[PDB]
Design an enzyme around this catalytic site. Structure first.
Site, PDB file in Angstrom:
ATOM      1  N   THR A   1       8.468   2.666  11.974  1.00 50.57           N
ATOM      2  CA  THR A   1       7.101   2.347  12.351  1.00 50.57           C
ATOM      3  C   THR A   1       6.865   0.844  12.393  1.00 50.57           C
ATOM      4  O   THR A   1       5.721   0.410  12.563  1.00 50.57           O
ATOM      5  CB  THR A   1       6.117   3.003  11.382  1.00 50.57           C
ATOM      6  OG1 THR A   1       6.237   2.393  10.093  1.00 50.57           O
ATOM      7  CG2 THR A   1       6.417   4.487  11.253  1.00 50.57           C
TER       8      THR A   1
ATOM      9  N   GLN B   1       0.828  -1.213   0.000  1.00 49.82           N
ATOM     10  CA  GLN B   1       0.000   0.000   0.000  1.00 49.82           C
ATOM     11  C   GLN B   1       0.860   1.259   0.000  1.00 49.82           C
ATOM     12  O   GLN B   1       0.326   2.374  -0.033  1.00 49.82           O
ATOM     13  CB  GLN B   1      -1.032  -0.016   1.143  1.00 49.82           C
ATOM     14  CG  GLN B   1      -0.550  -0.100   2.563  1.00 49.82           C
ATOM     15  CD  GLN B   1       0.199   1.118   3.059  1.00 49.82           C
ATOM     16  OE1 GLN B   1      -0.009   2.236   2.600  1.00 49.82           O
ATOM     17  NE2 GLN B   1       1.112   0.889   3.965  1.00 49.82           N
TER      18      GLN B   1
ATOM     19  N   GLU C   1      21.290   3.457 -22.279  1.00 48.64           N
ATOM     20  CA  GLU C   1      22.542   4.158 -22.020  1.00 48.64           C
ATOM     21  C   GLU C   1      22.774   4.330 -20.530  1.00 48.64           C
ATOM     22  O   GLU C   1      23.911   4.223 -20.056  1.00 48.64           O
ATOM     23  CB  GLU C   1      22.555   5.517 -22.722  1.00 48.64           C
ATOM     24  CG  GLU C   1      22.412   5.487 -24.240  1.00 48.64           C
ATOM     25  CD  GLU C   1      21.077   4.959 -24.728  1.00 48.64           C
ATOM     26  OE1 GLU C   1      20.218   4.617 -23.890  1.00 48.64           O
ATOM     27  OE2 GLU C   1      20.883   4.889 -25.958  1.00 48.64           O
TER      28      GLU C   1
HETATM   29  N1  LIG Z   1       5.005   6.466  -0.922  1.00 51.18           N
HETATM   30  C1  LIG Z   1       4.155   6.165   0.055  1.00 51.18           C
HETATM   31  N2  LIG Z   1       4.703   5.610   1.193  1.00 51.18           N
HETATM   32  C2  LIG Z   1       3.936   5.266   2.251  1.00 51.18           C
HETATM   33  C3  LIG Z   1       2.549   5.490   2.122  1.00 51.18           C
HETATM   34  N3  LIG Z   1       2.064   5.086   3.303  1.00 51.18           N
HETATM   35  C4  LIG Z   1       3.045   4.594   4.120  1.00 51.18           C
HETATM   36  N4  LIG Z   1       4.235   4.724   3.462  1.00 51.18           N
HETATM   37  C5  LIG Z   1       5.523   4.326   3.994  1.00 51.18           C
HETATM   38  O1  LIG Z   1       5.792   3.104   3.290  1.00 51.18           O
HETATM   39  C6  LIG Z   1       5.606   2.006   4.145  1.00 51.18           C
HETATM   40  C7  LIG Z   1       4.346   1.203   3.691  1.00 51.18           C
HETATM   41  O2  LIG Z   1       4.506  -0.217   3.589  1.00 51.18           O
HETATM   42  P1  LIG Z   1       3.415  -1.192   4.233  1.00 51.18           P
HETATM   43  O3  LIG Z   1       3.009  -0.525   5.530  1.00 51.18           O
HETATM   44  O4  LIG Z   1       3.891  -2.600   4.493  1.00 51.18           O
HETATM   45  O5  LIG Z   1       2.183  -1.263   3.202  1.00 51.18           O
HETATM   46  P2  LIG Z   1       1.752  -2.542   2.315  1.00 51.18           P
HETATM   47  O6  LIG Z   1       2.814  -3.629   2.238  1.00 51.18           O
HETATM   48  O7  LIG Z   1       1.263  -1.998   0.952  1.00 51.18           O
HETATM   49  O8  LIG Z   1       0.620  -3.290   3.176  1.00 51.18           O
HETATM   50  P3  LIG Z   1       0.219  -3.162   4.736  1.00 51.18           P
HETATM   51  O9  LIG Z   1       0.672  -4.290   5.629  1.00 51.18           O
HETATM   52  O10 LIG Z   1      -1.269  -3.250   4.751  1.00 51.18           O
HETATM   53  O11 LIG Z   1       0.664  -1.860   5.342  1.00 51.18           O
HETATM   54  C8  LIG Z   1       5.478   2.483   5.570  1.00 51.18           C
HETATM   55  O12 LIG Z   1       6.705   2.288   6.261  1.00 51.18           O
HETATM   56  C9  LIG Z   1       5.146   3.955   5.407  1.00 51.18           C
HETATM   57  O13 LIG Z   1       5.866   4.757   6.269  1.00 51.18           O
HETATM   58  C10 LIG Z   1       1.948   6.059   0.975  1.00 51.18           C
HETATM   59  O14 LIG Z   1       0.659   6.207   0.905  1.00 51.18           O
HETATM   60  N5  LIG Z   1       2.787   6.388  -0.046  1.00 51.18           N
END
Ligand SMILES: Nc1nc2c(ncn2[C@@H]2O[C@H](COP(=O)(O)OP(=O)(O)OP(=O)(O)O)[C@@H](O)[C@H]2O)c(=O)[nH]1
Ligand SMILES: Nc1nc2c(ncn2[C@@H]2O[C@H](COP(=O)(O)OP(=O)(O)OP(=O)(O)O)[C@@H](O)[C@H]2O)c(=O)[nH]1
EC number: 3.6.5.-
Lengths: 75, 118, 427, 74, 51, 438, 72
Positions: F179, F11, F254
Site C-alpha cells: 500500500t 498508527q 533465557e
Molecule cells: N496492526 C495494525 N496494522 C495496521 C493497522 N492499520 C494499518 N496497518 C498496517 O500497518 C501499516 C501502518 O503504518 P503507517 O501507515 O505508516 O501508520 P503510522 O506510521 O502510524 O502513520 P501514518 O502515516 O499516518 O499512516 C500499513 O502498511 C497497514 O497496512 C492497524 O490498525 N493495526
C-alpha cells in the site's frame, strides 16, 4: 405551599389578559404552556407525597389512593 | 466443595450487575434524546401554524404523532424505574452474602485438631 | 489541529463553490439557517476541519470568494444556500475583464491583491495549523487564470511548507466558444507547472459522454455537472474528518503519488453510477465495484489511459469493507495487465479505506491516477499554438496591454520540456 | 418527491412553470465605502428566510449583653 | 392486583414498629397501637410456660 | 517484581494494543470500569495483575503502557471508546502532523519536541517499577509514522538504559503486496538502524494471516479484528510464564541466552498450532503429536519462506494447558528423528521446552475454538534470507532510477545513508549463508 | 400451553416447585425461572428502546415532508 401560590397568581393573570382580548396572543401562548407544566409538577409532587405514610401508618390501613391509573401500554 | 460452589455463585451475580449498569447508561441517553425531539416537535407545530384544507389534515396527523411519541416516553421511564429498584435489591443481596458467610467461615477448624492432636 | 481554507476564483468558481459547499453542508447535516442537528456525532466533533464557529451553534464557511463579474456573485447570494456565507469576505472588482489574460494578470489585480491577501491572512492566523490551501478555479477561463496565477505565485513564498492544491477545468478538445482560450491556457500553465504541487484537470466533453452513457437523462443542468465533480471533492476530502484507519493527509498521498517535481496533473474518476433501472440489475459487490471503477468509460477527465501507460494510481474507498476483497482485486488486475504498468516500480497502487460511507449508497470509491496520457492534451494545444502564432493574429490586444511575445517563447519550450520528459521516462 | 431524499449526484428535481427571470441587484458602490445589501428577493422574485452577619446577635460585647440588669427580691 | 394493574410494593410485617411492653406510663394506650391480641396473648401464655 | 512496560508508535501500533488489553483485562476479570469486584485483592497492588497493572488505592487498574501517535484521530477515538477511564489520559500522547511516510521527516523535522515528554513519562513509570525486565515495543516496518520516531526514541532509551532486554514485534512488509511505494525506503532505513540495538526482533506478515484465516478458520470475510485477536493471543502466550504459575518456568532472559546463537542475528519466527474452527474442533481430536506435526507443517508458519530450503538453528516451544512430560519427550524425540527438518551439524539438540498449566482463554464473540492444549513455537532458521534477497533487487532498481528522492534531499538527508544501508543489508545476508553452511 | 410444559418439567420422584394452578405461588424460586426472569428483563428493555427509536425516525421523516409541502 410555594408551588401552589405561583400557580394561583399565574391563573389570575391569564384570566385578566383573556378579558382584555399580537404579542398579546403570544403571551397567551406562553402562559398556557406554563400552566400545563406547573400542573404536571404539582401532580407528580402529590404522587410522591402519598407514599410517605408507609413508614408510619399501621400496616392494615395503608393503601395509597392517589394515582392507581395504570398508564403503561405496550406489554 | 461448599467453598467452590459458593464462589461460583458470587461471581455469576457480579456479572449480572455488570450487565445491568451497562444497559442503564444508554437507556438514559436515549430518554434525553427523545425529549429533545419532542420539544422540537412543539416548535415545529407552531411553525406549521404560522402561514395561516390539506393543511388541516396535515396538522391533525402531526398532533396524533405528538400523542404516540409522548406514550413512548412514558413507557421509557416506567422501564427505568423498574431497573433502579432491581439494582438496589441485587446489590444489597450481594453485600449480604459477600460479608457474613466467608467471614464466619474463616473460623473453620483444622484437620489435626479435629484429629485431636492425634 | 488540522484545518483548510477554501479559495474560489472565476465564473466557474462561482457555481463550483455553491455546489461543493452545499454538498459538504448537507453531508455533515446542517440546516439552511446554520443551526446544528445532531444525528451522527463524529461529523460534529470533526466539523472544525473546515468550518469556523459562530455563536449560537452556527457554523460559517471558511471560504474566500472572488471574481470581477458581479452578477455571478448576486446569483450565488440569491441561491438556496448563499445566505450561509459571510458578507465580510466578498472582495470583488470594479469592472469586467473581457477575460483577456494579460489584463487579468497585470493591470486589474494590482489593487485587489492587497485586500484578498489581508482577508486570507487574517483567516490563516485565526486557524491553528494549516495543511494547506485548495483553490477551485479555471485554467482555460480568463479572469480566473489572471487572478489565480497571481495569488498562487504570491502565497508560496510565505507558506512554502503547505499543500497548495489547485483544481481547475480544462478546455474542450472539440469546441470551447472562447477563442483566446489557448493563450489563456499557455500563460496559465507556464506559472502553474512551476508553482503548484497538485492539480486536478477535468473536461466537459467526457461529462456529456457520461450523461449519455450512464445518466441517460436527456436534459442535464450544469448544476448537475457540478454535482458530479463535487462528489469527487467530497470523496478526496472524506478521510481527514473521519475515523477508521487510512493515513489520509493529501501530502501522505502526494509523496506516494508523484515521482518528480514537474509531474503535477491528475485525472479523476467516480464510483457507482447506476442507470435508470440497473439499480436492481446490479449485485452491489466489491468485484464489480472495482470492475466499473477502473474502466475506459467510467473515466471522465481527459482521454483514455489506453494510449500510454500508468506510473502511479491511488484509490480511496468508503464503506464497510475488508482488506481482502480490495487487495486480491488489485492483485487480480495486476496480473490481468502486468504489461501496461511500468517495470520501473512494482506495486504502483495506493489504497485507502474509511468506514463511514456517504449517504444514499452503502459502498463508494474515488479514483485518481498519474498515467502517460497528458501528452494528448498538451500536444494538441502545442500545435494549436504554433498554428495561431504563425501569423500572430489577435495579438494586438496583448501588445497594447504590454504583453510581448518573449513570454510566449519562454512558455512554449517549458511545455516542450513537459512533453519530452513525459515521453522520455515511459519510453 | 420525498422532500429531501438522498441527493445523489445522479438525479435531482426539475421544474418548468417559471417565467419571470430577473436577477436582483444587491451589490453596488454608491460612495467611498463599497456597499453590500442584505438580499431579499431571489430568482424571479420570491420569499426567502431571514451575606453572613448575625441578624440577632451582631456580636454585641458581653458588657452590653449584661449592662444594667438587676434582679430585685424581698 | 392480578390484571392490567400491578404495584410491586413491600408491606411491613409488624413486629418492630411497635411498643409491646406494659407499664403505667404506657397504659393510656393511644388507640393508634397495632395491638392485635392474638400474638400478644399467645406470648403472654408462652413466656408463662417458658419461665 | 516480574513486570514490563509497553510502548506503541505509528498508527499501526494502536489497534493491536487496543485488542491486547481487550484480552488482557479478561484473564484477571476486570470490567471496563477498571475495578476488581469485592473479592479480596484490592490494596497496594500485589497480585498476578502486578506484572501488567498497578491498581492503586482508588481500586483502578493502570496499564503500564504509552500510546504515542502523530494524528489525533485514533487516539481521540479510543479516548471516546469504552476504555477511556481505563487508560491514563496523558499516557495517550497525541501529535498533530504526519510523517508523510518520510522517515527522515519523522526523524528530524518533528522528533525533537515529543521525545522529552515521552522519556519523562518513561522515567515516572520506571521509578515505581521494581523488576523492570524490559519493554514491549510495537511499530511497523511500513511505518506510516512509526519508523523515524521509533528509531530516534529507541536509540535514546537504549543509551539511557543499558541493563535490560528489548523486544520488537514488527509487521514485516508483504512481499508482493504494497500500500506504499516509500515502503522499501523506510523499511531498509529502519532495518539498518535497528539490527544493532534490537535485542529480540520478531517478524510477522499479514497475507499469511489471511491465508490461515481462510484455510482452517473457515471464515472468508475476516479483518483486523481477527488478525489482531490472534496476534494478541500470541503475545499473551509468550507472557504466560510471567502471568501464571506452573510446573517449571521460563523467562525472556533465557529466551535470549539460548535462542539467539550469536551476536547480531536475532531475527526468529513465531508460530501457533491450534487455530481451529468450532465445527472442525467439535468432532475431531487434539493432542501433542498432531499439534506438533501441524506446527512444523511448513505452510502454517506466518512468513513466506521454506524451511526445507532453509536450515535450522534454534527452537523454543511453550505448551499451555495440561500435558505430561512423557508425551512431551516422546513426541519431541519423534520430531528429532524426523527426516525433512535439516538441523545443522552444529546443534545436536535445538529444543527449549516450557510448560504452564493455565489454558488459554477465549475472547467474547471471537472466532477461535475452545481449546485445552495450546502451544507456541519460536525458531531461529536460515530460511528468512529470501525476504531480503527479494527486497534488495527491487531497491537497487528503484534507487538507480532515484525517483522520489527530491522529498528527502529537500528536507535534509542525502543518498549516503541509503548507500550505507545497502552494505549493512549485504553484511546481513553474507553472514546468513555462511552460518547456514556447515 | 405453559400448563403442559410445567407438567413435563415437574413430574418425577425428584424435587418440585409448587407452580400451582392459580392464586399466589410459592416465594421460593428455581435456577431456570431465575435465569428466565433476567432474560425477560433484558428483552423488555430491548423492545421498548427499539420502539422509541423507530418512532423518532418516522417523526423526522414526517417533519421534513410537511415542512417542504408547506414551503411549496
Ligand atoms: N496492526 C495494525 N496494522 C495496521 C493497522 N492499520 C494499518 N496497518 C498496517 O500497518 C501499516 C501502518 O503504518 P503507517 O501507515 O505508516 O501508520 P503510522 O506510521 O502510524 O502513520 P501514518 O502515516 O499516518 O499512516 C500499513 O502498511 C497497514 O497496512 C492497524 O490498525 N493495526
Ligand atoms: N460557473 C460556471 N462555469 C461554467 C459554466 N459553463 C461553462 N463554464 C466554464 O467555466 C469557465 C471558467 O470561468 P472563470 O473561472 O470565472 O474564468 P474567467 O477569468 O472569468 O474567464 P472566462 O471563462 O473567459 O469568462 C468558463 O470559461 C466556462 O468555460 C457554468 O454553467 N457555470
Amino acid at each position: 405551599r410555594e408551588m401552589e401560590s405561583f400557580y394561583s397568581e399565574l391563573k389570575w393573570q391569564e384570566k385578566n389578559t383573556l378579558e382584555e382580548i399580537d404579542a398579546l396572543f403570544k403571551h397567551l401562548a406562553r402562559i398556557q404552556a406554563d400552566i400545563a407544566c406547573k400542573t404536571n409538577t404539582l401532580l407528580l409532587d402529590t404522587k410522591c407525597m402519598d407514599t410517605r405514610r408507609k413508614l408510619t401508618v399501621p400496616a392494615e390501613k395503608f393503601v395509597p389512593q392517589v394515582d392507581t391509573f395504570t398508564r403503561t401500554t405496550n406489554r | 466443595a461448599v467453598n467452590s460452589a459458593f464462589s461460583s455463585r458470587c461471581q455469576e451475580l457480579d456479572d449480572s450487575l455488570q450487565k445491568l449498569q451497562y444497559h442503564l447508561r444508554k437507556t438514559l441517553t436515549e430518554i434525553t434524546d427523545q425529549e429533545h425531539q419532542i420539544a422540537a416537535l412543539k416548535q415545529a407545530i407552531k411553525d406549521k401554524e404560522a402561514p395561516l384544507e390539506e393543511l388541516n389534515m396535515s396538522l391533525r396527523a402531526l398532533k396524533e404523532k405528538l400523542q404516540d411519541a409522548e406514550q413512548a416516553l412514558r413507557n421509557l421511564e416506567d422501564s427505568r424505574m423498574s431497573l433502579e429498584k432491581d439494582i438496589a435489591v441485587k446489590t444489597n443481596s450481594l453485600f449480604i452474602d459477600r460479608q457474613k458467610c466467608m467471614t464466619h467461615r474463616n473460623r473453620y477448624p483444622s484437620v489435626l485438631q479435629l484429629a485431636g492432636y492425634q | 489541529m488540522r484545518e483548510i481554507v477554501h479559495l474560489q476564483a472565476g465564473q466557474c468558481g462561482n457555481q463550483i463553490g455553491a455546489k461543493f459547499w452545499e454538498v459538504i453542508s448537507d453531508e455533515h447535516g446542517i440546516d439552511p439557517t446554520g443551526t446544528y442537528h445532531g444525528d451522527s456525532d463524529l461529523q460534529l466533533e470533526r466539523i472544525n476541519v473546515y468550518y469556523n464557529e459562530a455563536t449560537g451553534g452556527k457554523y460559517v464557511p471558511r471560504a474566500v470568494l472572488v471574481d470581477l463579474e458581479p452578477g455571478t456573485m448576486d446569483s450565488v447570494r440569491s441561491g438556496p444556500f448563499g445566505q450561509i456565507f459571510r458578507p465580510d469576505n466578498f472582495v470583488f472588482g470594479q469592472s469586467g475583464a473581457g477575460n483577456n489574460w494579460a489584463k487579468g494578470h497585470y493591470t486589474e489585480g494590482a489593487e485587489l491583491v492587497d485586500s484578498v491577501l489581508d482577508v486570507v491572512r487574517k483567516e490563516a492566523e485565526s486557524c491553528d495549523c494549516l495543511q494547506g490551501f485548495q483553490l477551485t478555479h479555471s485554467l482555460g477561463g480568463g479572469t480566473g487564470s489572471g487572478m489565480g496565477t497571481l495569488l498562487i505565485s504570491k502565497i508560496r513564498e510565505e507558506y512554502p511548507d503547505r499543500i497548495m492544491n489547485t483544481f481547475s477545468v480544462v478546455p474542450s478538445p472539440k469546441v470551447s466558444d472562447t477563442v483566446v482560450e489557448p493563450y489563456n491556457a499557455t500563460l496559465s500553465v507556464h506559472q502553474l507547472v512551476e508553482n503548484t504541487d497538485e492539480t486536478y484537470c477535468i473536461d466537459n466533453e467526457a461529462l456529456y459522454d457520461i450523461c449519455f452513457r450512464t445518466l441517460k437523462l436527456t436534459t442535464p443542468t450544469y448544476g448537475d455537472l457540478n454535482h458530479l465533480v463535487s462528489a469527487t471533492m467530497s470523496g478526496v476530502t472524506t478521510c481527514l474528518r473521519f475515523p477508521g484507519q487510512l493515513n489520509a493527509d493529501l501530502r501522505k498521498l502526494a509523496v506516494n503519488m508523484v515521482p518528480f517535481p514537474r509531474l503535477h496533473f491528475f485525472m479523476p474518476g467516480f464510483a457507482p453510477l447506476t442507470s435508470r433501472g440497473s439499480q436492481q440489475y446490479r449485485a452491489l459487490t466489491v468485484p464489480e465495484l472495482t470492475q466499473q471503477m477502473f474502466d475506459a468509460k467510467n473515466m471522465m477527465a481527459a482521454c483514455d489511459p489506453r494510449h500510454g501507460r500508468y506510473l502511479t494510481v491511488a484509490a480511496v474507498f468508503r464503506g464497510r469493507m475488508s482488506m481482502k476483497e480490495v487487495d486480491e482485486q488489485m492483485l487480480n488486475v495486476q496480473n490481468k495487465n502486468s504489461s501496461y504498468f511500468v517495470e520501473w516500480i512494482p506495486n504502483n497502487v495506493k489504497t485507502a479505506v474509511c468506514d463511514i460511507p456517504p449517504r444514499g449508497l452503502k459502498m463508494s470509491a474515488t479514483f485518481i491516477g498519474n498515467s502517460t496520457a497528458i501528452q494528448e492534451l498538451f500536444k494538441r494545444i502545442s500545435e494549436q499554438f504554433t498554428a495561431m502564432f504563425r501569423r500572430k493574429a489577435f495579438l494586438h490586444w496583448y501588445t497594447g496591454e504590454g504583453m510581448d511575445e518573449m513570454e510566449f517563447t519562454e512558455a512554449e519550450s517549458n511545455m516542450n520540456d513537459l512533453v519530452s520528459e513525459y515521453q522520455q521516462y515511459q519510453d | 418527491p420525498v422532500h429531501g431524499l438522498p441527493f445523489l449526484p445522479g438525479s435531482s428535481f426539475t421544474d418548468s412553470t417559471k417565467t419571470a427571470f430577473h436577477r436582483s441587484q444587491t451589490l453596488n458602490y454608491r460612495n467611498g465605502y463599497a456597499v453590500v445589501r442584505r438580499p431579499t428577493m431571489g430568482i424571479g422574485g420570491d420569499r426567502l428566510h431571514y451575606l453572613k452577619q448575625a441578624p440577632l446577635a451582631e456580636f454585641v460585647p458581653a458588657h452590653v449583653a449584661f449592662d444594667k440588669k438587676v434582679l430585685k427580691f424581698s | 392486583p392480578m390484571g392490567r394493574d400491578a404495584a410491586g410494593q413491600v408491606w411491613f410485617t409488624g413486629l418492630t414498629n411497635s411498643e409491646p411492653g406494659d407499664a403505667w406510663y404506657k397504659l393510656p394506650r393511644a388507640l393508634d397501637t397495632p395491638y392485635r391480641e392474638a400474638h400478644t396473648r399467645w406470648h403472654g401464655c408462652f413466656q408463662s410456660r417458658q419461665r | 517484581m516480574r513486570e514490563c512496560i509497553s510502548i506503541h508508535v505509528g498508527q499501526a501500533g494502536v489497534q493491536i494494543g487496543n485488542a491486547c488489553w481487550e484480552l488482557y483485562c479478561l484473564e484477571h476479570g476486570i470490567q471496563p470500569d477498571g475495578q476488581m469486584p469485592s473479592d479480596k485483592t484490592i490494596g497496594g497492588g500485589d497480585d498476578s495483575f502486578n506484572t501488567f497493572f498497578s491498581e492503586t488505592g482508588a481500586g483502578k487498574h493502570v496499564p503500564r503502557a504509552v500510546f504515542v501517535d502523530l494524528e489525533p484521530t485514533v487516539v481521540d477515538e479510543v479516548r471516546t471508546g469504552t476504555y477511556r477511564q481505563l487508560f491514563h489520559p496523558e499516557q495517550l500522547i497525541t501529535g498533530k502532523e504526519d510523517a508523510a511516510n518520510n522517515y527522515a521527516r519523522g526523524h528530524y523535522t518533528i522528533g525533537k519536541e515529543i521525545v522529552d515528554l515521552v522519556l519523562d513519562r518513561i522515567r515516572k513509570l520506571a521509578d515505581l517499577c521494581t523488576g523492570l525486565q524490559g519493554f514491549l515495543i510495537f511499530h511497523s516496518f511500513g511505518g506510516g509514522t512509526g519508523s523515524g520516531f521509533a528509531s530516534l526514541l529507541m536509540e535514546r532509551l537504549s543509551v539511557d538504559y543499558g541493563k535490560k532486554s528489548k523486544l520488537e514485534f514488527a509487521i514485516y512488509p508483504a512481499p508482493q503486496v504494497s500500500t506504499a511505494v516509500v515502503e522499501p525506503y523506510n523499511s531498509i532505513l529502519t532495518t539498518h538502524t535497528t539490527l544493532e540495538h534490537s535485542d529480540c526482533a520478531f517478524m510477522v506478515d499479514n497475507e499469511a494471516i489471511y491465508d490461515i484465516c481462510r484455510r482452517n478458520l473457515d471464515i472468508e470475510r475476516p479483518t483486523y479484528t481477527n488478525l489482531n485477536r490472534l496476534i494478541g493471543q500470541i503475545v499473551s502466550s509468550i507472557t504466560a510464564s510471567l502471568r501464571f504459575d506452573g510446573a517449571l518456568n521460563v523467562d525472556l532472559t533465557e529466551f535470549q541466552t539460548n535462542l539467539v546463537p550469536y551476536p547480531r542475528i536475532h531475527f526468529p519466527l513465531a508460530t501457533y498450532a491450534p487455530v481451529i474452527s468450532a465445527e472442525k474442533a467439535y468432532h475431531e481430536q487434539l493432542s501433542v503429536a498432531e499439534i506438533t506435526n501441524a506446527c512444523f507443517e511448513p505452510a502454517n508458519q506466518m512468513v513466506k519462506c521454506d524451511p526445507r530450503h532453509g536450515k535450522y538453528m534454534a527452537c523454543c516451544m511453550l505448551y499451555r494447558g495440561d500435558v505430561v512430560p512423557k508425551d512431551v519427550n516422546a513426541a519431541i524425540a519423534t520430531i528429532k528423528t524426523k527426516r525433512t527438518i535439516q538441523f545443522v551439524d552444529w546443534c545436536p539438540t535445538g529444543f527449549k521446552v516450557g510448560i504452564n498449566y493455565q489454558p488459554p482463554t477465549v475472547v467474547p464473540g471471537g472466532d477461535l475454538a475452545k481449546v485445552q492444549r495450546a502451544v507456541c513455537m519460536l525458531s531461529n532458521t536460515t530460511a528468512i534470507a529470501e525476504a531480503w534477497a527479494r527486497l534488495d533487487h527491487k531497491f537497487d532498481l528503484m534507487y538507480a532510477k532515484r525517483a522520489f528522492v527530491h522529498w528527502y534531499v529537500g528536507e535534509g538527508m542525502e543518498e549516503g545513508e541509503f548507500s550505507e544501508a545497502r552494505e549493512d543489508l549485504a553484511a546481513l545476508e553474507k553472514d546468513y549463508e555462511e552460518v547456514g553452511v556447515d | 400451553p405453559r400448563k403442559e410444559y410445567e407438567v413435563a418439567c415437574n413430574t418425577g420422584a425428584y424435587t418440585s416447585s409448587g407452580l400451582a394452578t392459580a392464586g399466589f405461588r410459592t416465594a421460593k424460586y428455581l435456577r431456570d425461572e431465575w435465569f428466565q426472569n433476567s432474560y425477560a428483563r433484558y428483552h423488555q428493555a430491548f423492545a421498548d428502546r427499539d420502539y422509541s427509536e423507530r418512532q423518532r425516525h418516522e417523526s423526522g421523516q414526517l417533519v421534513a415532508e410537511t415542512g417542504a409541502l408547506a414551503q411549496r
